[PDB]
Design a protein around this ligand. Structure first.
Ligand code: JXA
Ligand code: NAG
Ligand code: NA
Ligand code: NA
Ligand code: NA
Ligand code: NA
Ligand code: NA
Ligand code: NA
Ligand code: NA
Ligand code: NA
Ligand code: NA
Ligand code: NA
Ligand code: NA
Ligand code: NA
Ligand code: NA
Ligand code: NA
Ligand code: NA
Length: 497
């Protein structure tokens, strides 16, 4: 339909400019006959998921790298891709005029955008809020009679979620994570800093906190929203660090184990929301496999845990094989799910870099690595931020695939938006990762999957400056002759039948 309006802000590539009356979008998906492939291409030089087609031929013209599909080697099935409807994201979106808001939401959730099917929802406030609050700040309310949803939920988050779901083609799954409990449940009486639940698993504080999960699910269900899963705590390890600056609730692995076993698991099971899944960890994968060993070798905890949620912030010092791979080896029937990523929260990282191709590459590289190590899904952090990377009440300003400049009723789609979209748009839920064999050492990152209808999708990322000639072989169709340019990402799709 409408192409990208490029704009440069002095970094390595361009953003795409959208306003109240214009945003770049796709035509409805349409895919060609057997023997033809579809290629979507994004480049640092400015191409943004541009579509072209070509032949899959019986003859093998290329003499360079060959990537050979191996559809009989089957791995994990995919849950999906998405981002977080934080307070900061919803404030930025709702400060656009309504027509602009819809172009933003369609960008993420529609088939004319990139088909997100996962939304992470914080349970009350986190750093990406403009104030500190929980749903039950009234102290010594252990039956949670004064549990209530504030304006952030009822006015910002929930209406936007409702609109995302209306616009979405695919069913969207909601995932909830709490940052802090009511402070009168905490050893330190504060929203942040080093503190855990008071007492011990099974007691009144732990039972009240588990009841808080049910109260949250009831509240959202009253607004006609139901959750696929919750996490046992966002970044539980952070709450063990002296002086941690934002909302946290510390658990040791043993404390998470016992809380799930004694309190959260049974309470969820004894509730009308017993079908909601429980994900453990929700933290840096450096904590793996140890956290998995502690929780999952206890059968009274393990029976309640559906999967393990990981954050990407320490991926660089923890190789995937030693963490995701060793965890899948030890517990092959517990899914791994990437529940949060963002660029710009480390020091030295300037918060927002509009047009940064480098930060787009970081996203796709991470997604490819996750997929090659059994991860079933990948979830961005804030869906939208302002040009400073906020709001954020502790000024932990970070980057986001969409940056909203409300003073101009304008938002910018970063290279991160398109690098994610090379996956989210073309790997529907239930797709299965299959083998892809490289014929020789190379600089590319690639992954192959099969849609539920048996058709093929391959993503090829080139992080090097050099053009790499490439052949992709499907044993049942033939040879796809192409080139992966320097600083590019491609998604290929083709029927196999
Ligand atoms: O704002 C987000 C929510 O509060 C939850 N995750 C975000 C907060 N957060 C955590 C980190 C972090 C970064 C490194 Cl490098 C190592 C470690 Cl252990 C942690 N960065 N940002
Ligand atoms: C909106 O977007 C289009 C696309 O560049 C542009 O022609 C138009 O001037 C923009 N401005 C406003 C105020 O809508
Ligand atoms: Na730029
Ligand atoms: Na090969
Ligand atoms: Na929030
Ligand atoms: Na909230
Ligand atoms: Na406050
Ligand atoms: Na309340
Ligand atoms: Na859901
Ligand atoms: Na919270
Ligand atoms: Na909370
Ligand atoms: Na990590
Ligand atoms: Na973000
Ligand atoms: Na996002
Ligand atoms: Na299809
Ligand atoms: Na690469
Ligand atoms: Na490429």
């Amino acid at each position: 339909a409408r192409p990208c309006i490029p704009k440069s802000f002095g970094y390595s590539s361009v953003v795409c400019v959208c306003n109240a009356t214009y945003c770049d979008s796709f035509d409805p998906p349409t895919f060609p006959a057997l023997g033809t492939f579809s290629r979507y291409e994004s480049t640092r030089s400015g191409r943004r998921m541009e579509l072209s087609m070509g032949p899959i031929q019986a003859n093998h013209t290329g003499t360079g790298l060959l990537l050979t599909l191996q559809p009989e080697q089957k791995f994990q099935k995919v849950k999906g891709f998405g981002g977080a409807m934080t307070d900061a994201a919803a404030l930025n979106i709702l400060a656009l005029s309504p027509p602009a808001q819809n172009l933003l939401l369609k960008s993420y959730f529609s088939e004319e955008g990139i088909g997100y099917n996962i939304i992470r929802v914080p349970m009350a406030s986190c750093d990406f809020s403009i104030r500190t609050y929980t749903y039950a700040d009234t102290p010594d309310d252990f039956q949670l009679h004064n549990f209530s949803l504030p304006e952030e939920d009822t006015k910002l988050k929930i209406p936007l979620i409702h609109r995302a779901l209306q616009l979405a083609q695919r069913p969207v799954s909601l995932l909830a994570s709490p940052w802090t409990s009511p402070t009168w449940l905490k050893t330190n009486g504060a929203v942040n800093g080093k503190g855990s639940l008071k007492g011990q698993p099974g007691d009144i504080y732990h039972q009240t906190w588990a009841r808080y999960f049910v109260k949250f699910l009831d509240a959202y269900a009253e607004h006609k929203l139901q959750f696929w899963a919750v996490t046992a705590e966002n970044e539980p390890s952070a709450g063990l660090l002296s002086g941690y600056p934002f909302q946290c609730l510390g658990f040791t692995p043993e404390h998470q184990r016992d809380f799930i076993a004694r309190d959260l698991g049974p309470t969820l099971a004894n509730s009308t929301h017993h079908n909601v899944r429980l994900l453990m960890l929700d933290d840096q994968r450096l904590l793996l496999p140890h956290w998995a060993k502690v929780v999952l070798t206890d059968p009274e905890a393990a029976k309640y845990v559906h999967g393990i949620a990981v954050h990407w912030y320490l991926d660089f010092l923890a190789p995937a094989k030693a963490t995701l791979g060793e965890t899948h080896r030890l517990f092959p029937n517990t899914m791994l799910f990437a529940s949060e990523a963002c660029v710009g929260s480390k020091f030295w990282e300037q918060s927002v870099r509009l047009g940064s191709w480098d930060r787009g590459m970081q996203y796709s590289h991470s997604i490819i690595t996750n997929l090659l190590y059994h991860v079933v899904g990948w979830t961005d952090w804030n869906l939208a931020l302002n040009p400073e990377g906020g709001p954020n009440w502790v000024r932990n300003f970070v980057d986001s695939p969409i940056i909203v400049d409300i003073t101009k009723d304008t938002f910018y789609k970063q290279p991160m938006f398109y690098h994610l979209g090379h996956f989210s748009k073309f790997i529907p839920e239930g797709s299965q990762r299959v083998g892809l064999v490289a014929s020789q050492k190379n600089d590319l990152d690639a992954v192959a999957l099969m849609h539920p209808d048996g058709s093929a999708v391959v993503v090829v990322l080139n992080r090097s400056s050099k053009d790499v000639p490439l052949t992709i072989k499907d044993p049942a169709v033939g040879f796809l002759e192409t080139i992966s340019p320097g600083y590019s990402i491609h998604t290929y799709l083709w029927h196999r039948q």
